[PDB]
Amino acid sequence: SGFRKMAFPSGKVEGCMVQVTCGTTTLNGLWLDDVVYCPRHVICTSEDMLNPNYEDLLIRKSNHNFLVQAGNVQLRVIGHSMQNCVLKLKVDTANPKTPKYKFVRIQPGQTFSVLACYNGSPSGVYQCAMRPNFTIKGSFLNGSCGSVGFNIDYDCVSFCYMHHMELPTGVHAGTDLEGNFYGPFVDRQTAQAAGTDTTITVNVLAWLYAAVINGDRWFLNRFTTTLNDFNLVAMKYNYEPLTQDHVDILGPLSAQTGIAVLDMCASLKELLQNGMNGRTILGSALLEDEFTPFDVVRQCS
Amino acid sequence: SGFRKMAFPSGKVEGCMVQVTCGTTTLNGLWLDDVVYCPRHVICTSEDMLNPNYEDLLIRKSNHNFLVQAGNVQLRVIGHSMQNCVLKLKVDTANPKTPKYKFVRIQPGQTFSVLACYNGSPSGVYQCAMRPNFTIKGSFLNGSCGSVGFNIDYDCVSFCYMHHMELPTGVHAGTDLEGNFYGPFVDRQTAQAAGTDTTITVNVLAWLYAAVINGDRWFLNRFTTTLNDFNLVAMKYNYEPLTQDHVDILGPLSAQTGIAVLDMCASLKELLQNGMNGRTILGSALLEDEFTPFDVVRQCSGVTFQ
Ligand SMILES: *[C@H](O)[C@H](C[C@@H]1CCNC1=O)NC(=O)[C@@H]1C[C@H](OC)CN1C(=O)[C@@H](NC(=O)OC(C)(C)C)C(C)C
Ligand SMILES: *[C@H](O)[C@H](C[C@@H]1CCNC1=O)NC(=O)[C@@H]1C[C@H](OC)CN1C(=O)[C@@H](NC(=O)OC(C)(C)C)C(C)C
Ligand SMILES: [Cl-]
Ligand SMILES: [Cl-]
Ligand code: NA
Ligand code: NA
């Protein structure tokens, strides 16, 4: 029993982290086989941060302009290419610690582990969710770019996020490992702002099911709701719509606990209306939305 | 910016986890040099669960009764001994992935990372605190015993916890790596319970500093207090006493933010006496007490591990 924000063990990713320097900029790279992936803004100069022409900047680089360090070892760059907002540096040695891996682009509401790194060395690991507004609420300082987000269901690392940018509200933006940003963001210093965020309803419901599995019932009630009436209420609290896909996905947790999905929706409606009246759920006095249904089944079963 | 509940990178510990099976019980062991450490209750059985005599149960055991697997490779046990509530299985092979490490016993209020493992395979990592009542609020299922807690300093892993037991309230009890339980707990099926717990005051203060560093300032006020006066409020709200050593440890955060510790204590006093008035601090509507001052300094400055 118990319920924690639980990350994946980070060792398989730690073995891939390197330091990349170009000019006066240092950040992290991800070393898989004979390629190092990193944010392309490592090649920006201070003159050129608003409207960098990355194709023009990159054609001017020699391989020796990229200093790649793996622990105490300098890796030799032998080629380079750009894929969207990621730079791929070909190096002369394959990483002997390369895990089984894949690249996945995730949808809002999905969670992943972040291995925050500086100068190619790991600082710590934590859980994040892709927010509905395509930001993540990370913990990132100068030099953290190139840190990655990942899941390790089974024995294969699925890389889903690479860190690029901090936005004015203190939240974070980045790309998949094919270099496509999540959300409308761009790797330029032009004015950008996150949209209004919303709460990930399906995840809140998953976490209420976790609470029941762990022995809580105080927030249950004798009411139910239609799906459309639930959504009409929930949107008044800046919750995301609940779709039939979400209802289907919650089926297994519904079966395990004996609480129909729309009955749990009625519990959530009442919690939004009333608050917790001095109580807590799984050690929180707020409705938690960064556990997915899959996360709850992973941790409770 | 940002502030998250952050665990240590777990790779140095993942390479030490093995599976240990004795009879019909499987749990995890920690393989360091040529010794595997695991809970001694691995030797109990369903006809012995209530009041085992461990002294006497181990002599009946031989080396080949312990099956130890490092991934898909069997490790041959060549000796066995007990130390307090931990079993030490000598194996014929030193772990080539043994990190620089030491065994430490932590104090209530200190935090650590747990590498939750099943069948010798690491499955998750999370951050915990040793509660004042000597339990931890972990997340553990059947088969998790032998999972360990640790901190890292520079390049050295300090192992501080091995998991043994779940108590009736769903919190957890275990030992240091010398097999001494934290708290007044024993490894057998007799009645036991977590005592009443308290809140780790110095950690709440550290987290309020983390909040100020990240721009959350609404709870600050013009007032200050004294150590004596605040400790009367702490006692009233089942908070741990604040000592002068706690005040000194927070010195760096006081200097960085301009909020002296007793100035922040006046904030905490008002929060305890008045609540949050509907507001949140670092995304929480509760006062968080599982970040130490060092945790805050480390995360806010980007310290890394070699
Ligand atoms: C890469 O290490 C770094 C990580 C940042 C630094 C502070 N926290 C982080 O997460 N990223 C950048 O420095 C990135 C490069 C951009 O210039 C090419 C500027 N970057 C920012 O993150 C800055 N944000 C920014 O300019 O935001 C807009 C576009 C909204 C103005 C940030 C340093 C203010
Ligand atoms: C080791 O893998 C396992 C971990 C437990 C399983 C459920 N969550 C965990 O944290 N520990 C035990 O199974 C342990 C062995 C004891 O018998 C020698 C019984 N154990 C318990 O954790 C049980 N607790 C218990 O008996 O509590 C008292 C002493 C208060 C009755 C638990 C499985 C009920
Ligand atoms: Cl005053
Ligand atoms: Cl909370
Ligand atoms: Na993609
Ligand atoms: Na004050």
| Per-position DSSP letters for B130-190, written without gaps between them | --TTS-B-----TT-TT-EEEEEETTEEEEEEEEEEE-TTS-EEEE-TTSPBSSS--SSSS
Surrounding residues of ion ligand 4, Cβ less than 5 A: A 284-286; B 284-286
Q: Give the position of tokens 């690479």.
A: A162
Instruction: Tell me the two tokens of residue B77.
Output: 């046990």
Q: Give the position of tokens 């009879």.
A: B23
Apex CA B291: angle with CA B103 and CA A210, to 5°?
A: 95
- Active-site amino acid positions of A: 41, 145
| Structural biology method used | X-ray
CA dist., res. B200 & res. A214, Å (int): 25
CA dist., res. B130 & res. B238, Å (int): 16
Q: What is the CATH code for A201-300?
A: 1.10.1840.10
The chain B residue lying nearest A72, using CA atoms, is B306
Residue B214's nearest CA partner among B280, B137, B260, B163 is B280
In units of Å, what resolution does this entry have?
1.5
CA dist., res. A50 & res. B61, Å (int): 71
Helix axes A201-213, A261-274, angle to 10 degrees: 100
Who contacts A277 (Cβ-Cβ below 8 Å, separation ≥6)? Answer: none
Instruction: Tell me the two tokens of residue B199.
Output: 């809140």
Helices and strands, counts by H and E, chain A: 8, 13
10 Å CB burial of residue B267 (0-12, 13-18, 19+) is buried
Q: Is B300 helix (H, G, I), strand (E, B) or coil?
A: helix
Contact A164, A196 (CB under 8 A): no
Instruction: Tell me the two tokens of residue B52.
Output: 């085992």
Who contacts A155 (Cβ-Cβ below 8 Å, separation ≥6)? Answer: A100
In Å, what is the CA distance from B179 to each residue of A128, B146, B160? 35, 11, 10
Instruction: Tell me the two tokens of residue B23.
Output: 């009879």
Q: Parallel, antiparallel, or unpaired: how do β-strands A101-103 and A157-166 relate?
A: parallel
Q: Give the position of tokens 């290419």.
A: A81
Question: Which ligand 2 atom is nearest residue B141's CA?
Answer: 8
Q: Is A54 helix (H, G, I), strand (E, B) or coil?
A: helix
Instruction: Tell me the two tokens of residue B301.
Output: 């400055």
Residue B2's nearest CA partner among A6, A128, A181, A105 is A128
CA dist., res. B268 & res. B230, Å (int): 9
Residue A163's nearest CA partner among A13, A5, A12 is A13
Instruction: Tell me the two tokens of residue A24.
Output: 């006066």
Task: Please report the beta strands in B5-85, taking only residues with DSSP state E, as ranges in sequence order.
Answer: 17-22, 25-32, 35-39, 66-70, 73-75, 77-83
Residue A181's nearest CA partner among A169, A168, A194 is A194
Q: Is A70 helix (H, G, I), strand (E, B) or coil?
A: strand
Instruction: Tell me the two tokens of residue A292.
Output: 């997915």
Residue B216's nearest CA partner among B283, B292, B284, B281 is B281
Apex CA B33: angle with CA B31 and CA B38, to 5°?
A: 30
Residue A276's nearest CA partner among B286, B196, B237, B272 is B286
In CATH terms, the fold of domain B201-301 is main proteinase (3clpro) structure, domain 3 (1.10.1840)
In Å, what is the CA distance from B90 to each residue of A153, B19, B31, B35, B56? 33, 14, 9, 5, 19
10 Å CB burial of residue A13 (0-12, 13-18, 19+) is buried
Residue B11's nearest CA partner among A67, A122, A244 is A122
Q: Is A58 helix (H, G, I), strand (E, B) or coil?
A: helix
In total, chain A counts a number of residues equal to 301
10 Å CB burial of residue A229 (0-12, 13-18, 19+) is middle
CA dist., res. B206 & res. B290, Å (int): 10
Closest residue by Cα to atom 24, ligand 1, is A166
Give the number of beta-carbon pairs within 8 Å between A and B. 140
What sign does the CA torsion over B50, B55, B60, B63 have? positive
Q: Is A228 helix (H, G, I), strand (E, B) or coil?
A: helix
AA letter at B104? V
Tell me, in angstroms, the distance from the centre of ligand 6 to residue B239's CA.
19
CA dist., res. A132 & res. A177, Å (int): 20
Residue B181's nearest CA partner among B255, B228, B137, B130 is B130
Closest Cα in chain A, distance from residue B140 (Å)? 6
In Å, what is the CA distance from A275 to each residue of A11, A53, A285? 40, 51, 9
Helix axes B261-274, B201-213, angle to 10 degrees: 100
Contact A109, A132 (CB under 8 A): yes
Contact A81, A61 (CB under 8 A): no
Contact B149, B160 (CB under 8 A): yes
Residue A121's nearest CA partner among A27, A33, A42 is A27
Instruction: Tell me the two tokens of residue B253.
Output: 């955060």
Residue B22: beta bridge partners?
A: B25, B66
10 Å CB burial of residue A254 (0-12, 13-18, 19+) is middle
Ligand 2 probe mutation, B166, B167, B185, most atoms within 8 A of CB: B166
In Å, what is the CA distance from B303 to each residue of A140, A225, B127? 12, 50, 17
CA dist., res. B185 & res. B188, Å (int): 9
CA dist., res. A235 & res. B234, Å (int): 41
Ligand nearest to the CA of B205: 6
CA dist., res. A28 & res. A213, Å (int): 40
Closest residue by Cα to atom 24, ligand 2, is B166
CA dist., res. B128 & res. B110, Å (int): 9
Who contacts A206 (Cβ-Cβ below 8 Å, separation ≥6)? Answer: A250, A253, A291, A292, A293, A295, A296
Tell me, in angstroms, the distance from the centre of ligand 6 to residue A62's CA.
56
Cβ-defined contact of A283 to B137 (cutoff 8 Å): yes
The chain B residue lying nearest A14, using CA atoms, is B11
Residue B125's nearest CA partner among B88, B152, B85, B153 is B152
Apex CA A137: angle with CA A136 and CA A143, to 5°?
A: 85
| Residue A43 CB less than 6 A away from ligand 1 | no
Contact B8, B152 (CB under 8 A): yes
What sign does the CA torsion over B32, B34, B39, B42 have? positive
CA dist., res. B113 & res. B306, Å (int): 17
Contact B27, B40 (CB under 8 A): no
Instruction: Tell me the two tokens of residue B235.
Output: 């006692």
In Å, what is the CA distance from A263 to each residue of A99, A142, A206, A216, A300? 43, 46, 13, 15, 21
- Residue A78 is given by DSSP the state E
Helix (H) or strand (E) holding A185: none
| Residue B119 CB less than 6 A away from ligand 2 | no
CA dist., res. B211 & res. B207, Å (int): 6
